[model samples]
Target: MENLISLVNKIQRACTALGDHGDSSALTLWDSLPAIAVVGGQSSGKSSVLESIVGKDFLPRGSGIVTRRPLVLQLQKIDDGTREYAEFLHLPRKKFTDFAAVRKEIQDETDRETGRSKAISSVPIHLSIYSPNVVNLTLIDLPGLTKVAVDGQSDSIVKDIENMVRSYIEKPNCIILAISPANQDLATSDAIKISREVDPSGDRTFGVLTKIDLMDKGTDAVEILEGRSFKLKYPWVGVVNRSQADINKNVDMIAARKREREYFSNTTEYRHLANKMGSEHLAKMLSKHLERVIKSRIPGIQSLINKTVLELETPAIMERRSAISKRLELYRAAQSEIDAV
Candidate 1:
């Protein structure tokens, strides 16, 4: 058991290192790196869900297009008793220990790169954190899918958002974490619809139902959760995010997690879901899924790397082949002379 656990940890670290290389130009020969991409319509609790997973409220929260640039969040578990700090690929010289400063840095960098307008940039902000409580995971938070143009935005903004979502989800290596609110109709969920088009088999997509506490009275998405409405390869997990009021009152994650547990366990309609749902469970599941996927893909990745190396050496091998041909010609001439003598 201990050896198995160590192997899992080692695999996580290796996969994460590969992802780090993929983030730069080292592994650009491939289409995309293995990553969990969070996609949903605006205000569908996408940010809240991510904050819940990280157990920190570092993501910027606002009314519209809060996440103007894609945030590549990499969480590494450091059990060496070192303090947790945030490192940025773009800002290589600095590290942030203050969580609030991390939030501020995101906002500032977004504004600096994308301007004060609501327009989004394809440029991504990379945040790497070493923390004891976090699992080794890499997640990308994209700009939420938008429908209408607002705040002097162009009419093509919706298409732009869709294109961005497709760019990430369409990649074979990306694992889609399609998020939706429990109160909304599952059939009409934009997130699921977009994800399903790219992943019809539902093999690489995981459905996440947030705001479970806000479901309408006498109505629970039991059908959706149970995969009766539409059969998904993986079961949909449910979670309750902290409301805006809770954030205003400075509610911490521990208290929020406790409240979430009580809500699921005590509520009559959702009592059964208590066993299968929670942000913590979702985080752990994501970590395990990433590990499995990365491990399974290592052989293919190895093959690709080896193929590239062979291709690079082919020209040199051909150059050496001519010298061998000349030597063979001389040997043949010498053998003919010996036979004649």
Candidate 2:
């Protein structure tokens, strides 16, 4: 397990070396990197679910400004519980200890390219968050799926969002975590339709049910939880995130998680499966899933690394004996020509 967990770090180190070698191949390698991507609509609690996993409040929330670009966040677990910081690929040296600044950096950089508008961009924002509170993992938080271009947004906002989401989920090495609110109908689920559209076989798709606490009365979506609604190869995991009220009041993720656990255990519909559900379970499952899939992808990654080296680096060749031996002439060629006649 430990080896599998560190394999991602190893792949990252190799990528760095390749990137430093100045070969653009490393850039393409990132396209096939094995990771989990969360796809959901706005107000679907995707941000809260991620916050709960990291036990941090860095994601922009309640501002009505959704993610304008893809966030490729790497969550690395360190030994010191008190030592926590973040690093961005764009800014390699700075260590951001205060998460409030981390949140601002996301906004500032996003605003820079997105023109401070609601229009989204496909260019991803790469950053790593090292913390002791979470597991060693990586997640790509994509822009929440949108249907139309509202207000200052562009005309292609709808098509842009769809294309961006599909680009990541369609990667064979990527694991799809489709976050659909339990409050909505499965048939009408926006996230579900996209997941099914890209991954028809549902091999790499993992469903996450958000807003479990807000489901309509009398029906707890237990059937969907237990496999009755849309068949994703992987069983769905349900989680309850902090409400809008909780966010405005600054209810911390740690505290919100405590309530999340209680909500699952307190209910009759979910009591039996409470142990297998919730934010913590979701974190563990995602961590374990990424590790396992990464293991299977290592061979391809290794060859990719070697392929980069083969293309950019050098190896000795015996053919270089020319110009130096200058004595060597076309005598053999002339002799062969005469012998052939």
Candidate 3:
């Protein structure tokens, strides 16, 4: 069988190569690409988990809506022992190996669109990273779900964040990876509840339970992991987010992985489930699952493309021609008036 990851990479490349006629103007092709999107509530360790999966700490991070723009992270897995780099959609044909520049450019480009304020924008940043260590996948990262507008933020920040999240999850093709803190009451978890509204069967929602290490000391997500508590069809993966102290201490992800492994193995509650959890497991699972999603949706997409070609063969694709002609007529009338003058 052809590697599903490879298939996903192929489709992703095709989507990129074929541009709106694309960039911001061409969102249908981008949104139609089968991929997972990361969504979570405030302070949910989303950045920490994403960095771990990408095997780099390059995201601009802090408290309260750190990710103001939707980020599309496209991971293209390559051969072992080869050098790796990244490319951004906005900055055409430039290679970025220094992940620090990657982080800096993210800040720079975001400010270009939404300014440096806390205001949010639905426009996404498309960042593609090609590396031997990662897999073929795309994860759309959104602003962490927030409830209030703090100082220097827009008044409708709460409504804006929710509406942005809703727009993405509501897309049927979008695989929603709802990352929630395990320590909180799962019912009260906005991540779970919001995902439920769109994916009640849990079929399209993969749950990542963070903060297992801080789970009320004597408590663990045994039942949650065992699927007795939540009936999510896609099984859950548990992760231990890097503590602020760890983030400050410059704990690289390699060391962080060891700590995550030891915690799952040393703790009695999570011991049996150890094999099924952790960041690496989630990474592998995500790659293959998205492959399945793309595989299932391929035939439909093929027909859609066929229909489009058929439409283009006729005048249907030129439906906007009349509007352009109208614009041209106005320009011509203005020029005639100038000539008369």
Candidate 4:
């Protein structure tokens, strides 16, 4: 796991170098960097899952489409115990200390790009957050999937969100972190349904079941959690989200995390799941899983480049041979004419 963590950091460094400093001409030759996308239906605790992973309440919270643009969150673990700060790619020279400021900036940037609209934007806001509690992970918080347009939203909103989600998941190397509330049926989960379309075998997709504490009495996701129903290649993790009441009461993230652990530890039905659940376990799995995914893809990427080279050179070689044949025919005609003269 430690080696995998190191590999994840290496991957992050490479992507950061390419995205931040590489020349555009050089960047065009490289492929898109591997990333994990957090996706789910509206109000499915997607933002809450991210907040839990980072142990912060930075993301904006609202009813409909709070995340109007894709937020590319890059978390780096710093060893010096320094105060954590956030930097935005679009907002230059500005470092955000208070998470409230980070949330406000996202709203402002969204409005600036989308113009007070509920429509989603493809233009992503890059945020680099440095903290001691985080591992090196790059996560994209996408707009919540919504089919119907509410007030202040256009009717075509669904299509826009779907296109954006497809853009990220269509990449074979991209890992899908499909978030869904435990109270909801896994079969109807938009995240799972769409991921199946792109990743039919579920090799690169992982399931995150949030709001597990909110499930009704005598109910559980045993089948889905154990992969008995869907049989995903990866294990489905269960997590408990901080309720709105808890957020309003100014609950500390540490307490929230502890409570989540106890939920699985103290409950008779879920004690066995304690090891496979929660954001901590989810983070470890994501890091290790991504490392393996990247290693597996390296050979394929090289193979693709080799195939492209062959395809490009073969046609050129054929064209060259045809030109040589034409030149030889012209030379023979000239020699014949000279002999007749």
Candidate 5:
């Protein structure tokens, strides 16, 4: 009877720890669950890709100067075995879609210079939302980090955005998906550096190269943007955008780079080199680039997980991080707009 009681206690504790059905904030399930954070710079198309994945135009629409913020999009299952919408924000959700109101609020800020006020005055305080898909996933759309003002002010917009990113990073269940235009640049470098600073072990991260269609095909342009053989130095994956034209035209090929495949004569030093490195070197490189741009920028991603220990409520798989494979880290960042979504 004592043993039966102990087993019952274990089962009861497991039920108690189940993630909140109606809440989406990290505070409720931070270390206890898994999540993905999508990050990128201003106008980098992070919002659009999110819109596509969620199968709806989920971001704010309108022409205000420009503004970005981190929005956590959670898809949860409820008591009735049906799903519902739950948005977490310091402010209410209704204001996110109202551009005129946002414009007025921006006009009232004193710190915004007359010339810059149009762009910086009323930063959007609302988060994003999507209702259709249900894949044990929570997608977070973060404001473009580069859009914020660099000037020192108590409530600078950039600072606020950074704080949100940092808070997500510390959440035990959080993973990062960094976004960069196919035109990879210093902004990606900044993201990688910050990611490394947070997780020296390259855990919980992935990358998406946005606007792939902008780059002309049938040339070295894509390779140049994606970092050919050299970019594979880290753990990442590169997912090129799939554009509307691509869908409408029914193009046989999607906007993926040739980095996934490398063909050389079967009986030469080149083939030997490919074999020496192993047949999948090229694909491996593409994956690494994606992770750096997409995943955690740190090195020891493997060490973050341990299987020997077991907990009833913690995830069975960490799910976000991947182990770093061979190849040295030496390359300059570059870009191309392969395809659009």
Candidate 6:
């Protein structure tokens, strides 16, 4: 019980500090900023989707070689008349040539590629994006969890990214928006394994199945997604990653056909609570929503047992700690390689 209490306290403090303006008891309400983590297997189009919403080519150039590092970009509001503003994570610039080295740096470690034979796998690179219009949302582009090497039993780059994920889960608050390709192998199997550890609870974690446009429009993705409840117990929401320009064009064409028309979106709000959704308000909501899921879904009254509890299991916890240690070791190795180069 003490351990649980300690963990809750740590989470509360970290979450409050995530974006507090140093004073919470001010006169005005503090707006809450929701965060979304974009993750999936390699070449899953995580960067492309982000670039689309950001309305800029801020993503790193894709490589034909295997990818191996995680990068975070925080978008801030720009004063320009553009749609939204963005800011970078201010991480040290890394070699674009070596994806493996890039993975080591994001986690602040260097031994990421020890006991390896490849020299080019030591470079670091990542593109995190944030915007103002979506002021309360921070998007993270994590390293591809599923890599060709992992499947082929060759050198792998997922450990560093996994370590970075562990670091975030331990933090107080953040909503996860996981992206997966429509392919069943990529979508269900790998997602179960990865999400199982990060978000065991269905509240803060939500699935965004990208490349749905690539799949047979008539196919039932929901039917396919039903069995995945073993690990992902949350909502399996599918999203189409088309250009916003295209959506605007279509909406315009449709609206023009009708002389008079109205549109309504299905949105939610706190019925009995506050009216505005500030960053602090949003954070508190996430905490409460997650707490509800933990309490209701877990068949127990424990508040902290929703997601992080799933992150810490007998074998999974050991694996997570081992991966963290390995990431640090590999980060050091990559740093040495970078200095020598």
Task: State which candidate has the highest lDDT.
Answer: 3
TM-score of each: 0.76, 0.74, 0.73, 0.74, 0.45, 0.45
User: What residue runs in model 4 are displaced by over 4 Å at the alpha carbon?
Assistant: 1-4, 7-33, 76-83, 131-136, 293-341
What local distance difference test score does each model get? 0.72, 0.72, 0.74, 0.72, 0.40, 0.41
After TM-score superposition, the amount by which residue 176's alpha carbon in candidate 2 deviates from its true location, in angstroms, is: 0.7
Q: For residues 1-341, what per-residue lDDT tens digits would candidate 3 score against the true structure?
A: 12445545453434433321223332325433566777889878777777777778788776565788888887776766488889999998999999878989988888888865677788989999887666655677788888777877888878888889888789887788788998898987888878999888787888999998777876779999888898788788999867878866777778889999998988888899997889988877876665555444333334334434454556556685553444344334322323110
Give me the displacement of residue 299 in model 5, in angstroms. Answer: 27
Ten residues in sequence with the least summed lDDT for candidate 1 = 332-341
lDDT of 1 by residue, 1-341 (tens): 11222345453333334322323334312322467788988878787787877677788765567887889887776765578888888889797889988988998888888764787877889998877655555678888887787886767778988887788788887888889888888767888888889999888888899888888888887777777876777778888888878877878788999998888788876678677788877876766665454345344344334433354466444564543343344334323323211
lDDT of 5 by residue, 1-341 (tens): 11222222222223222311113422313322356666666656565555445443334422232334445556443344443343435445533334334334433332244344333322334333322333334666655665445443335666666676677776656666555565555344545655666666656554455544354454222343345632422433333443445444533221212321232223232343333221133223423333333222222122212211222223557642211111111110111111100
For 1-341, candidate 4 gives per-residue lDDT tens digits of 33444534444434333222313423211122467788889878788787766667788765557888888887777775788888899977887898878988888988988875676788999998977655666778888888788877777778989888888788886778888888877778998878888889888888898888888888987777887877778888999877878877867778888888899888878888788988889877866665554444333233223433454566444554543343334334322323110
Model 2 residue 248 CA deviation in Å:
0.6
Looking at model 2, which ten-residue stretch has the lowest summed lDDT? 332-341
The residue pairs that clash in candidate 3, if any, are none
- CA lDDT, candidate 5, residue 254: 18
* RMSD to the hidden true structure, all candidates: 13.1, 12.9, 14.1, 14.6, 16.1, 18.6
Tens-place lDDT digits, model 6, residues 79-101: 43454323223444322333334
Error of 5 at 171 (Å): 3.6
